[PDB]
């Protein structure tokens, strides 16, 4: 995450690392939503242009981490995919529309003070919280600088304002959809921060002032550069892709 | 080691695990003889018939291990080769005569309760412990079974007697030389044992009944099969080579 800080321990339970078995290297982020189900961005697993297509077998899910590299032996729980499900109208070809994947593990996960799931929004939590001006929080161990292509030594947290449909759209040349969202400061607000490469799939969450729980609102999907003056990051729209989730999650 | 035991903590400090960097996996044993010199078997480095030929850069050095697999974090030490010298009259082409190699670390080693050096013999000591009857101890993490191709999870100790020149020569078809020695029980001595594939370089020590210090007599060099009846294994004769050792280490 660009323009971040260091995550404090036990600050992001639901956070999941998605690791390539070989070459053993970080791939993306994930959020733990239940004990044996995980939610990631779809291009993490499939992106034809780039020749990307993985399986329930080239990936390891690493849950309850902090150190990006250190094999945190007593805290983290490495797991494996039983099955990976990608949204059927995931748009690789045009604008990454519906960057959503769900991978369900072979066995459930041990909840630690470290392994704890994040909640999905209600039509209403999702409602009142998804408002421009409101800050959300992003986290990941991807690239530190647009161009460092370096890497965080520990998880990275960073809080960003949700921007407006318009701004976002005019913000780019890419096609926006009802299933995306932009987040970040105006090139005038004198603050920064962005998600960046190696960041997709990680959770964009908000803490509810009603029930005071943490909700997952966006998924790190795409962007143009990283921490660029007046260009925002696009998050997948989870509330709005939520019935498919509720669906794959019956069978 | 075939027909061994499980080593005991801190029981054998001069042991070194020679690591192939890629693919990450075991090569051979070694012995710390000082804080920057290590002694292994020459055919661990170079063996042209199988196209083995490594550089001070293909190997990693692990000092103070027990567990074959586990990266014991505040015990174990990893070092890297500055140089590597193979005995010039090492006979890879005939019968492995002078399977002695010295590799010099880039930096010295910290001696912990676990990292400690073994003594080299004196024409003096060499002369009274090296004799048929007398048991020496062999150590390692290679193959358990002649044919399991498996591996021990913890160091292995095995205490075998030193066999009589003929016996040995009559044992194999190979050209036995003055710079070798064979060790083991006779086909009828109702005890087994032996070193095996994956155990080269490892020390064959002996405990002086006088000055009561542990000495290195052989270096596991070759054999034919593993823990096979009326067939003994060969060890480089370190004291006959004690002067080449003397020699390279000085200058």
């Amino acid at each position: 995450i660009v323009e971040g800080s260091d995550a404090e321990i036990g600050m992001s339970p639901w956070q999941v690392m998605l690791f390539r078995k070989s070459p053993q290297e970080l791939l993306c982020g994930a959020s733990l939503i239940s004990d044996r189900w995980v939610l990631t961005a779809a291009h993490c697993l499939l992106y034809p242009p780039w020749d990307k297509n993985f399986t329930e077998n080239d990936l390891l899910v690493r849950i309850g981490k902090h150190s990006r590299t250190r094999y945190e032996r007593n805290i983290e729980k490495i797991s494996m995919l039983e099955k990976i499900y990608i949204h059927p109208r995931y748009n690789w070809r045009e604008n990454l529309d519906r960057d959503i994947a769900l991978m369900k593990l072979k066995k459930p996960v041990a909840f630690s003070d470290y392994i704890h799931p994040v909640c999905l929004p209600d039509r209403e939590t999702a409602a009142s919280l998804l408002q421009a001006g409101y800050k959300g929080r992003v986290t990941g161990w991807g690239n530190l600088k647009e161009t460092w292509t370096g890497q965080p030594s520990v998880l990275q947290v960073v809080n960003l304002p949700i921007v407006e449909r318009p701004v976002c759209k005019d913000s780019t040349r890419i096609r926006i959809t009802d299933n995306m969202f932009c987040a970040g400061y105006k090139p005038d607000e004198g603050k920064r921060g962005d998600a960046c490469e190696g960041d997709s799939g990680g959770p964009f969450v908000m803490k509810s002032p009603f029930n005071n729980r943490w909700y997952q609102m966006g998924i790190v999907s795409w962007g143009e550069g990283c921490d660029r003056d007046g260009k925002y990051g696009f998050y997948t729209h989870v509330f709005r892709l939520k019935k498919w989730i509720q669906k794959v999650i019956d069978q | 080691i075939v027909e061994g035991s499980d080593a005991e903590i801190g029981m054998s400090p001069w042991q070194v695990m020679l690591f192939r960097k890629s693919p990450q996996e075991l090569l051979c044993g070694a012995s710390l003889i000082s804080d920057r010199w290590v002694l292994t078997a020459a055919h661990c480095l170079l063996y042209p018939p199988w196209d083995k030929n490594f550089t001070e850069n293909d190997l990693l050095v692990r000092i103070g291990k027990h567990s074959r697999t586990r990266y014991e974090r505040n015990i174990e030490k990893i070092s890297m080769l500055e140089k590597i010298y193979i005995h010039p009259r090492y006979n890879w082409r005939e019968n492995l005569d002078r399977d002695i190699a010295l590799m010099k670390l880039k930096k010295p080693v910290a001696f912990s309760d676990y990292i400690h050096p073994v003594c080299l013999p004196d024409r003096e000591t060499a002369a009274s412990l090296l004799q048929a009857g007398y048991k020496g101890r062999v150590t390692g993490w290679g193959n358990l079974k002649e044919t399991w191709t498996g591996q021990p999870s913890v160091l292995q100790v095995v205490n075998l007697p030193i066999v009589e020149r003929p016996v040995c020569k009559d044992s194999t078809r190979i050209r036995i030389t003055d710079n070798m020695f064979c060790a083991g029980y006779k086909p009828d001595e109702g005890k087994r044992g032996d070193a095996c594939e994956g155990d080269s370089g490892g020390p064959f020590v002996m405990k002086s009944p006088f000055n009561n210090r542990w000495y290195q007599m052989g270096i596991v060099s070759w054999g034919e099969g593993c823990d096979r009846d009326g067939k003994y294994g060969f060890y480089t004769h370190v004291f006959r080579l004690k002067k080449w050792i003397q020699k390279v280490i000085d200058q």
Partner: peptide, 17 residues
């Protein structure tokens, strides 16, 4: 299996040392 690193043994993850 790669730079700096070292393969540990529980989901033979690399430990970077």
């Amino acid at each position: 299996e790669c730079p700096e690193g070292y393969i540990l043994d529980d989901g033979f993850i690399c430990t970077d040392i």
